[PDB]
């Protein structure tokens, strides 16, 4: 029957409910406008209670920031400047570098030595 769920299946469903719950709040808040201290604190408590990691949190923020529909709603609800704080909240590690150009094609080159004591 539908209610005959194994302990493991229950854990999987719960985890899915927790992720969907967090994602849903992120979407709603993003649609209201930019992130605020009040909302950041609320999300911190929510991620704690729903066991959402810091990086899963940042990924969800990026998802919402990248959503044009939510962005458009935010612009209509609270005007421009609706993503500056979200953009920082969803910060990520990225390879950052200037495009290659001769004047910047840089490297340190050395003549390798021997070993031990010399």
């Amino acid at each position: 029957g539908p209610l005959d769920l194994s302990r493991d299946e229950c854990k999987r469903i719960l985890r899915k409910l927790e992720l969907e719950a967090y994602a849903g709040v992120i979407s709603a808040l993003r649609a209201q406008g930019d992130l605020t201290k009040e909302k950041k604190d609320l999300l911190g408590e929510l991620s704690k209670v729903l066991s959402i990691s810091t990086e899963r949190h940042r990924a969800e923020v990026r998802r919402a920031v990248n959503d044009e529909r939510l962005t458009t709603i935010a612009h209509n609800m609270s005007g421009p400047n609706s993503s500056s704080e979200w953009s920082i909240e969803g910060r990520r590690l990225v390879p950052l570098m200037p495009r290659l150009v001769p004047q910047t094609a840089f490297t340190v080159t050395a003549n390798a030595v021997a070993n031990a004591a010399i």
Binding site: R12, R15, K16, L19, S53, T54, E55, R56, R58, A59, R92, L93, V94, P95, L96, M97, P98, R99, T104
Partner: protein, 66 residues
């Protein structure tokens, strides 16, 4: 168990962080809604193309002023 210990195929990296002191990747596994952190040192050799794809997609340029 978590990470590669789960015995699942890596699908794509959704995030990275050095907060622990070492580079870690938040890995999304094929056929699973649960993602976990794995050492970059480990992902680098076990799924090099997944790591490369991750970096290449996020490559960010910054020009020199003058």
């Amino acid at each position: 168990p978590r990470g590669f210990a789960r015995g699942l195929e890596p699908e794509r990296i959704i995030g990275a962080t050095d907060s622990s002191g070492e580079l870690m990747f938040l890995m999304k596994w094929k056929n699973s809604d649960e993602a976990d952190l794995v050492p970059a040192k480990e992902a680098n050799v076990k799924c090099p193309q997944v790591v490369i794809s991750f970096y290449e997609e996020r490559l960010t340029w910054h020009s020199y002023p003058s």
